[PDB]
RNA sequence: CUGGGCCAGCAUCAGUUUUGGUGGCAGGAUAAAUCCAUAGGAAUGUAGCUUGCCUCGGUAAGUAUUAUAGCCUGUG
RNA sequence: AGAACUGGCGAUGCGGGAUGAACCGAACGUAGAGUUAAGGUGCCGGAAUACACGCUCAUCAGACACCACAAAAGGUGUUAGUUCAUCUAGACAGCCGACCGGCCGAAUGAACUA
RNA sequence: UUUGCUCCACACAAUAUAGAUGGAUACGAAUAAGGCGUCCUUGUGGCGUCGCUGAACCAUAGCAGGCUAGCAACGGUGCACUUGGCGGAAAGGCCUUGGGUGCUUGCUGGCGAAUUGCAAUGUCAUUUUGCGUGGGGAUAAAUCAUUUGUAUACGACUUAGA
C-alpha cells in the first residue's frame, strides 16, 4: 500500500563519529574505523544531532520498507563493533580423532590449519580473514576465539572454519565431529 | 553574410505508406524546429525544393532542383506531407530538403 | 462508464386504469451520459421490482453536482462485484474532492487489482465519511495525520530535444 | 542538426538507445556511440546472461560457420540490437548502418569531441529505482569478450588527460569571467539585458 | 573533527502553503499554492492572485518551488489570498533566478528583427571591450 | 519584334475539403462552486488560561470553540 | 463421421489477422481530393517512447479473438477484500516489579476469497 | 622491353557524390544527489550559488559581401612561414613561440548597386582519374620454363640456379 514515511533511528554513543555521504557510511570509534557501501538501497540519512541519526524511506513498499530496518541494524553493528567489538568462540567436538588446530603462515598469509579431522591425512586450511584475530584459549579445552570490529568478517571467518570440516559420506547424526561456533559476544563489556 | 539561408532545413523521410504499400505521389518531410502539428500549420502551403547534382549541364551548371509544396500535416510530431512536381527519387529518403518562407502570410 | 456523472433517475411503472399514480422510484446512477444512466436505471429496477422498460416509463433524469467540490473528503464505497469464480461484496475507502472523482478512481481500482470490468461491478452505496477516526482503511489514514509533509524524490523531467548536452539530475 | 552526433553510451539502456539511433540513421543522422561497455540492460546480470546463452545456443546444425554469429564485445552486442531495428537486408538499411559507428571506450577522434546523451534511453531517468540492471561490459566479458581490462586501463588514462584539459578549460572561463567584471557593470551591459542578453 | 557529519538531501516538500508552478493547463505558467493534500499524487491548489482557480491538480502537472508560506490546512480561497500576499510570495518568487530566467527568455522570444539586429551590434561592441581587457593581468 | 500551343506565379471567384482566431445566443439546482450574509457545530483544537518545564530556547499534559489561525454544516 | 438455420469459401481480388481458402473490415470500371472501417501508432513501419490510476520482477515473466494449449493441487511473493475472535471496561508486541501490575496509546489473532 | 616511377606546385577537361550551406561547442562521477564560485589544517570539510532544460554558448551587418578617405584600439581574426612541447586506443591531432602579411562592423566619412524588369536561375562545395607544365627524389621484383621432395590428383607447397 506504499506507506508515505517510515523511519528508524541509530543510537550514536558518546565518542564515536559517523560520516555518511553518497550513501557510503564511515564509522570511526575507539576500536578503529569501519565503512559500508549502502548505495544498493534507496534510503535517506538525516543526522538529528551528534548522538542520533535517522534512516528514512519515503513512499516505500513492503519490500522497500523491509530494507530500512536492516540498514539500521547494519549501521548499528558497525557502531557496536567499533566500540564493544565482537568475539566469536568455537569448540572442537570430536568423538575419537583429536582435531588439531593451529595457526600457520605462507608468504605473509596466516591461515588456520586443521589436522587429523576424523582421522584425515588431509590438512584443511582456512585463511585468516583480514582484521579478525585468532587466539586459542588456555582455560577451556578446544576453544580458538575469533574477534574483531566487523561482525561480518568474524562470523564468516568463523564459519569458514566451521564448514571446512563437514563430515562427508557418513551419517551426520552419528558423526558429530567438527568445529562449531559455541558463543557469540563482545570483546569488551564482558562476554 | 556568413549565412545566406532563406529556407528552413528539412529531411525527406518516406513516401506516404501503409504497412505494406506506399504512395510515391506524396512525401513525408521532417522540418527543423517543428515538433507539433500546431507548428507545422505555419509551413502549410510553403514551397520545398530538393536540390541535387548531375553530370550534364542544363544552363552552365550541373546543379538541378526538384520543386514541391507542403500540403498538409502528418501526425502528432510535426511531420508534414508534401507533393512535388515529380515524385522524389526514394533514394532521397534521409536526404536534406529545403522549405522556403514563401508564399508568406506574415 | 467513461468519465463520470451522477444522475437522479426517477421512473415508474406505466399507469393503468386499475392503478393510476403508481409509485415513483429514484436511483443515483454513476454513468458517462444520460443514455447509459437511463439504461443503467432499468437494469437495477429489473433486479428489484417487477418492471420492464417496456412496461414502465422514466419520469425525470437530472444531473447532481457536488455540493462542495473544492472540499477534500473521505469516502466509504460499498461494492458488489462478480469475480471469475464467484460474486462478492467489498468496502473500500477513497479520498477525493467529489463522488464522481471517487467513483472514477473506484472503477480503476476494481479493474487494477481485482480485474473487475465495469459490467461486473455494482456500486451498492457511496457516502462521505462523516468524521475522521471513523476511517477504517489505513491507506487513507496516512494522509489524515496532523501537519502532513513528504518529499517526492527522484525527479524525472520529460525532455523535448532527443539529445541532451548534460547528465541530468533528479534533485527536486 | 550537427553533422555527426557522438553519444556517450554509459548509463543508457540498450534497447531504447538502439531504437533512437536506428531512426536517426534512417532519417540521415550520422551517429557514433562511445563507451559501449558502460551501457546498461534492464534485468539482473544472471538473467541477461542466461538470455545470451540462448542466443549462443543457436547455430546452423550442419555448419556452425553459416549459423547466427555470436559477437561478444559490447559494441557488437549493441549493434545487433540496432541492426535488428533497421531493415538491413535492403540497400537503404545498408546505407543507414553505414551512417553509424560504435566503439568501446572513446577512441582518439571522438575523445576530444563533445558527447551527448539520449534522455529517453537514459537509465536513471527511465528505470524505476530498485530495479536491477546489467552493465554491458561486465556481461560482455562473461561471454568471452577479451578486451575489458585494456579498455578500462586506457579509459582510466584518458580520464586523467580529460581531467587536466577540463582543469585548464575551467581556469580560463574563470579568467574570462574575471575580466568580464567591469563590463558586467558597463553601459553596453544594461543595453543588452534590456533586450534579454 | 569528531562531528558525525551526514548529507541529507533536502527536498521540496508537498505540504500546505508550498507555492507551486503549473506546467500544463490554461493555468500553465502561473504560481499556485497547496491548500490540502489528497494522496501521493492529487493535491488541492488555489492560485487566487495569479488567476488559478481552486481545484484538484495532479502533482505531475505542477513543479514544486523552493517557496513556502504559512497556510492552515484547507483554507478557503479568501484566506489563501490573504496569507499569500501577507507572506509576499509573489515578491519572493520574482527575486529568484528561476523566475528571472523565465522572464529573460520570454523577452528574447519577444524580440523583433530590428531588435535582433541591435543585439548583435551591441554584442560586437561588448565583445571588443572584453577581448581587449582580456590580455590584462 | 507580335500570333497560337504549352508551362509557372499572383489576384478575383466557383465546387469538394481541411485547419485556426473570434462574436452573439439557449438550457441546468434558470449549472454546482468562489464571494457575501445569517444560525449552529466540531477537531488532524488557533489565541488565551491552570499544570509541571525552564539550558525561560523547547515548553507535552489539562483546559479552552475564535480569541492573535482557520475549518465544517444549515439557511438565504 | 453425420443433420438443422443462416452466413460464407468454392467462383473473389481489396484493408486487417506477420505467415494463411473459409476469421475481422469491406466486396472491385479509370482517376483526383477528403474521411474512415477492422487493425494499429518504441524501432523494423505510416501513426503520441501521449495523458491517467493501479498491478506485475518471473535463474523460459508477459504481451490480445479465431490461433497455433495446459489441469488438479500448492506458495509466510505481493496486492486488495471477507469472516470470526480480542481491544479504550486500554488488548496485542516491547521494556520495567504461567499470572498480575506500571509505562505506551491503537490496534490484534485466526480462518478465508481472488 | 618506348611512352616509364613517385613527391610537390597551381593549371584545363572529364569523373562520381545515401545528400556541406554560420560552428560535432572534449572533465570525471552521482542521481535517496550533484555543478560552479569561494575558503582553507585539502577533508565523506566551511560558507555562497545554480538547476526546474541547448528557449544555451560562440558566431552573425558590408557588390556571394565592391571602391576610397580617416578615428580610436595594441585588441580581434584569416592566411603563408617559424621556435618548442604533449599526444600510440585508430596517437596523424592538441597546446605553444616568433615574426611577416591581409581584413576588421569598435567608431566617423565619401562613392557604387537599378534594366537580373513581380518568384523559377544558384554559393561551389568533394571524391577518384586523365592530359599538361615548373622544379624535387628513386633506379625493383614476380611469374613462366628449369630445378629439390620436408609437398603434391591438377593447381598449390617447398628448395636450387648470373
Ligand atoms: Mg564478508
Ligand atoms: Mg553410509
Ligand atoms: Mg547421506
Ligand atoms: Mg503527380
Ligand atoms: Mg503520376
Ligand atoms: Mg493557391
Ligand atoms: Mg511527370
Ligand atoms: Mg503526372
Ligand atoms: Mg445528453
Ligand atoms: Mg417486488
Ligand atoms: Mg452496506
Ligand atoms: Mg460466492
Ligand atoms: Mg465498515
Ligand atoms: Mg486503494
Ligand atoms: Mg452481477
Ligand atoms: Mg528538455
Ligand atoms: Mg541539454
Ligand atoms: Mg555529457
Ligand atoms: Mg539478446
Ligand atoms: Mg540479403
Ligand atoms: Mg567501427
Ligand atoms: Mg571463442
Ligand atoms: Mg564458446
Ligand atoms: Mg493512489
Ligand atoms: Mg474556395
Ligand atoms: Mg446563468
Ligand atoms: Mg457581518
Ligand atoms: Mg492552545
Ligand atoms: Mg469570525
Ligand atoms: Mg484547520
Ligand atoms: Mg447557496
Ligand atoms: Mg464435418
Ligand atoms: Mg435449427
Ligand atoms: Mg461467417
Ligand atoms: Mg461466391
Ligand atoms: Mg471475399
Ligand atoms: Mg493481406
Ligand atoms: Mg495470427
Ligand atoms: Mg489476409
Ligand atoms: Mg461479427
Ligand atoms: Mg527487423
Ligand atoms: Mg514512426
Ligand atoms: Mg484490443
Ligand atoms: Mg497464446
Ligand atoms: Mg502444434
Ligand atoms: Mg497458469
Ligand atoms: Mg490454481
Ligand atoms: Mg496468494
Ligand atoms: Mg497461514
Ligand atoms: Mg496475507
Ligand atoms: Mg475497534
Ligand atoms: Mg509490534
Ligand atoms: Mg486482521
Ligand atoms: Mg603512363
Ligand atoms: Mg558505381
Ligand atoms: Mg580537495
Ligand atoms: Mg552545494
Ligand atoms: Mg552554454
Ligand atoms: Mg580602416
Ligand atoms: Mg594590429
Ligand atoms: Mg594577424
Ligand atoms: Mg594569430
Ligand atoms: Mg575512426
Ligand atoms: Mg600528420
Ligand atoms: Mg604519418
Ligand atoms: Mg601573431
Ligand atoms: Mg616421390
Ligand atoms: Mg612422396
Ligand atoms: Mg605432381
Determine whether the interchain pair E9/A44 forms a contact, defined as Cβ–Cβ distance below 8 Å: yes
Same domain, C82 and C127: yes
Same domain, C138 and C97: yes
Residue B39 backbone dihedrals phi, psi, to 5 degrees: -60, -40
Which grid coordinates belong to D197?
542578453
Q: Give, in Å, how far the C1' of F50 lies from the CA of E73.
A: 29
Let me know if residue C108 belongs to a domain. Answer: yes
CA dihedral E30, E36, E42, E45 (to 10 degrees): -20
Nearest nucleotide (C1') to alpha carbon of B79 = G47
Percent helix, percent strand, percent coil in chain A, to nearest 5:
20, 40, 40
Find chains touching chain C: ≥3 CB pairs under 8 Å.
A, D, E
CATH of the domain at C125: 3.10.20.10
Same domain, C10 and C58: yes
Positive or negative: CA dihedral D127, D133, D136, D140: negative
Angle between helices D74-84 and D14-26 (to 10 degrees): 60
The cell 502553503 sits on which residue? E17
Let me know if residue C76 belongs to a domain. Answer: yes
Nucleotides of F under 7 A from a protein CB: 8-11, 18-19, 28-29, 31-36, 42-45, 69-74
Let me know if residue C151 belongs to a domain. Answer: no
For A30, half-sphere exposure in the C-beta direction (CA atoms, 13 angstrom radius) is: 11
**Residue D176 contacts E where some CB pair is shorter than 8 Å:** yes
Same domain, C83 and C141: yes
The cell 507572506 sits on which residue? E87
Which grid coordinates belong to D67?
549459423
Cross-strand pairs, A28: A17, A33
Taking alpha carbons only, the member of C45, C52, C102 closest to residue C73 is C102
Which of C44, C69, C94 finishes a domain? C69
The cell 542466443 sits on which residue? D55
Contact C31, C41 (CB under 8 A): no
Evaluate the omega torsion of the peptide bond into residue C160 and state whether it is cis, within 30 degrees of 0: no
Which grid coordinates belong to E39?
494522496
Same domain, C22 and C65: yes
In the 8-state DSSP scheme, what is residue A9?
E
In the 8-state DSSP scheme, what is residue E12?
P
Which grid coordinates belong to D131?
530495479
Nearest chain E residue to A60, by CA: E40
A167: left (phi over 0), alpha (psi -120 to 50) or beta: left
Counted domains in chain C: 2
Let me know if residue C132 belongs to a domain. Answer: yes
Contact C43, C51 (CB under 8 A): no
Residue D75 backbone dihedrals phi, psi, to 5 degrees: -50, -40
* Per-residue H/E/C for C66-102: CCCCCCCEEEEEEEEEECCCCEEEEEEEEEECCHHHH
Cross-strand pairs, A9: A54
Same domain, C22 and C46: yes
Computed on alpha carbons and rounded to an integer, the radius of gyration of chain E in Å comes to: 21
Let me know if residue C156 belongs to a domain. Answer: no
Entry resolution (Å): 3.3
Q: Contacts for C136-143 with beta carbons within 8 Å, 24 or more apart?
A: C136/C91, C136/C93, C137/C91, C137/C92, C137/C93, C138/A1, C139/A1, C139/A2, C139/C93, C140/C74, C140/C93, C140/C94, C140/C95, C142/A3, C142/A4, C143/A4, C143/C95, C143/E37, C143/E38, C143/E39
Which of C69, C96, C126 finishes a domain? C69
Q: Which residue is nearest to nucleotide H89 (CA to C1')?
A: D107
- Domains of chain A are 1-85 (3.90.930.12), 86-191 (3.90.930.12)
Contact E59, E42 (CB under 8 A): yes
Contact B81, B29 (CB under 8 A): yes
B window 70-89: Cβ near strand F (< 7 A): 72, 85
Let me know if residue C39 belongs to a domain. Answer: yes
How far lies A113's CA from each of A93, A100, C156, in Å?
16, 8, 56
Cross-strand pairs, C73: C96
Computed on alpha carbons and rounded to an integer, the radius of gyration of chain B in Å comes to: 14
SS3 B98: strand
Residue C94 to chain E, least CA–CA distance (Å): 10
Same domain, C76 and C65: no
Let me know if residue C167 belongs to a domain. Answer: no
Let me know if residue C165 belongs to a domain. Answer: no
Exp. method: X-ray
Chain pair A-E, CB pairs under 8 angstroms: 40
Which grid coordinates belong to B93?
529518403
Same domain, C39 and C8: yes
Residue A1 to chain C, least CA–CA distance (Å): 6
Residue B14 backbone dihedrals phi, psi, to 5 degrees: -155, 165
Q: Give, in Å, how far the C1' of F9 lies from the CA of B85.
A: 15
C4: left (phi over 0), alpha (psi -120 to 50) or beta: beta
Contact A150, A157 (CB under 8 A): no
Determine whether the interchain pair D1/B9 forms a contact, defined as Cβ–Cβ distance below 8 Å: yes
Q: Quick check: D24 CB within 7 A of strand G?
A: no
Sheet order of strands, A86-93 included: A133-135, A145-148, A86-93, A178-186
Where does D1-99 show beta strands of DSSP type E? 4-8, 30-34, 40-42
Where does E41-96 show beta strands of DSSP type E? 42-47, 52-58, 62-68
Same domain, C98 and C129: yes
Same domain, C75 and C140: yes
Computed on alpha carbons and rounded to an integer, the radius of gyration of chain A in Å comes to: 20
Positive or negative: CA dihedral A170, A171, A176, A178: positive
Computed on alpha carbons and rounded to an integer, the radius of gyration of chain C in Å comes to: 22
Same domain, C43 and C104: no
Burial class (CB in 10 A: 0-12, 13-18, 19+), B59: exposed
Which of C16, C44, C69 finishes a domain? C69
Burial class (CB in 10 A: 0-12, 13-18, 19+), D15: middle
Which residues span the domain enclosing C21? Answer: 3-69
Same domain, C22 and C64: yes
Amino acid at each position: 500500500m506504499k506507506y508515505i514515511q517510515t523511519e528508524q533511528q541509530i543510537e550514536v554513543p558518546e565518542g564515536v563519529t559517523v560520516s555518511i555521504k553518497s550513501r557510503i557510511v564511515k564509522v570511526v570509534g575507539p576500536r578503529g574505523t569501519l565503512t559500508k557501501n549502502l548505495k544498493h538501497i534507496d534510503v535517506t540519512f538525516t543526522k538529528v544531532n551528534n548522538q542520533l541519526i535517522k534512516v528514512a524511506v519515503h513512499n516505500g513498499g513492503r519490500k522497500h520498507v523491509a530494507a530500512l530496518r536492516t540498514v539500521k541494524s547494519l549501521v548499528d553493528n558497525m557502531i557496536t563493533g567499533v566500540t564493544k567489538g565482537y568475539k566469536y568462540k568455537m569448540r572442537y567436538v570430536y568423538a575419537h580423532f583429536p582435531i588439531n588446530v593451529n595457526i600457520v603462515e605462507k608468504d605473509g598469509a596466516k591461515f588456520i590449519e586443521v589436522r587429523n579431522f576424523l582421522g584425515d591425512k588431509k590438512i584443511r586450511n582456512v585463511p585468516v580473514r583480514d582484521g579478525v584475530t585468532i587466539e586459542f584459549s588456555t582455560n577451556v579445552k578446544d576453544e580458538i576465539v575469533l574477534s574483531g570490529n566487523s561482525v561480518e568478517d568474524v562470523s564468516q571467518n568463523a564459519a569458514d572454519l566451521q564448514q571446512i570440516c563437514r563430515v562427508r559420506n557418513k551419517d551426520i547424526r552419528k558423526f558429530l565431529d567438527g568445529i562449531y561456533v559455541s558463543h557469540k559476544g563482545f570483546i569488551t563489556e564482558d562476554l | 553574410a556568413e549565412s545566406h539561408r532563406l529556407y528552413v532545413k528539412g529531411k525527406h523521410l518516406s513516401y506516404q505508406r501503409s504497412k505494406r504499400v506506399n504512395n510515391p505521389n506524396v512525401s513525408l518531410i521532417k522540418i527543423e524546429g517543428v515538433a507539433t502539428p500546431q507548428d507545422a500549420q505555419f509551413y502549410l502551403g510553403k514551397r520545398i525544393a530538393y536540390v541535387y547534382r548531375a553530370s550534364k549541364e542544363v544552363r552552365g551548371s550541373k546543379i538541378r532542383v526538384m520543386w514541391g509544396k507542403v500540403t498538409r500535416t502528418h501526425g502528432n510530431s510535426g511531420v508534414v506531407r508534401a507533393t512535388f512536381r515529380n515524385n522524389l527519387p526514394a533514394k532521397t529518403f534521409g536526404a536534406s530538403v529545403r522549405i522556403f518562407l514563401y508564399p508568406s502570410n506574415i | 462508464m467513461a468519465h463520470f456523472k451522477e444522475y437522479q433517475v426517477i421512473g415508474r411503472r406505466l399507469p393503468t386504469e386499475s392503478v393510476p399514480e403508481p409509485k415513483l422510484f429514484r436511483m443515483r446512477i454513476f454513468a458517462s451520459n444520460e443514455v447509459i444512466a437511463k439504461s443503467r436505471y432499468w437494469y437495477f429496477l429489473q433486479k428489484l421490482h417487477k418492471v420492464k422498460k417496456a412496461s414502465g416509463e422514466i419520469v425525470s433524469i437530472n444531473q447532481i453536482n457536488e455540493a462542495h467540490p473544492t472540499k477534500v473528503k473521505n469516502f466509504g464505497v460499498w461494492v458488489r462485484y462478480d469475480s471469475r469464480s464467484g460474486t462478492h461484496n467489498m468496502y473500500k475507502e477513497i479520498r477525493d474532492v467529489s463522488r464522481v472523482a471517487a467513483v472514477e478512481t473506484l472503477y480503476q481500482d476494481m479493474a487494477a487489482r481485482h480485474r473487475a470490468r465495469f459490467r461486473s461491478i455494482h456500486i451498492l452505496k457511496v457516502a462521505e465519511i462523516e468524521k475522521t477516526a471513523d476511517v477504517k482503511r489505513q491507506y487513507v489514514k496516512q494522509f489524515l495525520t496532523k501537519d502532513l509533509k513528504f518529499p517526492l524524490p527522484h525527479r524525472v523531467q520529460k525532455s523535448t530535444k532527443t539529445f541532451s548536452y548534460k547528465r541530468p539530475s533528479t534533485f527536486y | 542538426v550537427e553533422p555527426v552526433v557522438v553519444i556517450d553510451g554509459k548509463g543508457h539502456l540498450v534497447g531504447r538507445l538502439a531504437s533512437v539511433v536506428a531512426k536517426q540513421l534512417l532519417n540521415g543522422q550520422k551517429i557514433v556511440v562511445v563507451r559501449a561497455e558502460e551501457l546498461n540492460i534492464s534485468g539482473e546480470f544472471f538473467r541477461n546472461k542466461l538470455k545470451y546463452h540462448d542466443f549462443l545456443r543457436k547455430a546452423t546444425a550442419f555448419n556452425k560457420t553459416r549459423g547466427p554469429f555470436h559477437f561478444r564485445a559490447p559494441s557488437r552486442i549493441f549493434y545487433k540490437a540496432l541492426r535488428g531495428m533497421v531493415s538491413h537486408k535492403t540497400a537503404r538499411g545498408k546505407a543507414a548502418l553505414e551512417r553509424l559507428k560504435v566503439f568501446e571506450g572513446i577512441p582518439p577522434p571522438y575523445d576530444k569531441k563533445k558527447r551527448v546523451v539520449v534522455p529517453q534511453a537514459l537509465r536513471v531517468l527511465r528505470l524505476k529505482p530498485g530495479r536491477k540492471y546489467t552493465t554491458l561490459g561486465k556481461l560482455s566479458t562473461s561471454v568471452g569478450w577479451k578486451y575489458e581490462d585494456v579498455v578500462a586501463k586506457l579509459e582510466a588514462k584518458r580520464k586523467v588527460s580529460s581531467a587536466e584539459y577540463y582543469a585548464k578549460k575551467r581556469a580560463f572561463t574563470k579568467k574570462v569571467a574575471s575580466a568580464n567584471a567591469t563590463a558586467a557593470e558597463s553601459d553596453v551591459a544594461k543595453q543588452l539585458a534590456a533586450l534579454g542578453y | 573533527s569528531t562531528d558525525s557529519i551526514v548529507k541529507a538531501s533536502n527536498w521540496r516538500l508537498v505540504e500546505v502553503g508550498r507555492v507551486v508552478l503549473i506546467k500544463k493547463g490554461q493555468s500553465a505558467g502561473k504560481l499556485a499554492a497547496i491548500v490540502e493534500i489528497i494522496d501521493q499524487k492529487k493535491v488541492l491548489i488555489d492560485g487566487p492572485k495569479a488567476g488559478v482557480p481552486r481545484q484538484a491538480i495532479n502533482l505531475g502537472q505542477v513543479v514544486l518551488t523552493p517557496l513556502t508560506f504559512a497556510l492552515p490546512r484547507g483554507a478557503r480561497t479568501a484566506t489563501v489570498s490573504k496569507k499569500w500576499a501577507a507572506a509576499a510570495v509573489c515578491e519572493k518568487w520574482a527575486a529568484s533566478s528561476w523566475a528571472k530566467k523565465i522572464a529573460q527568455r520570454e523577452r528574447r522570444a519577444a524580440l523583433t528583427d530590428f531588435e535582433r539586429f541591435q543585439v548583435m551590434v551591441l554584442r560586437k561592441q561588448k565583445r571588443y571591450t572584453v577581448k581587449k581587457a582580456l590580455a590584462k593581468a
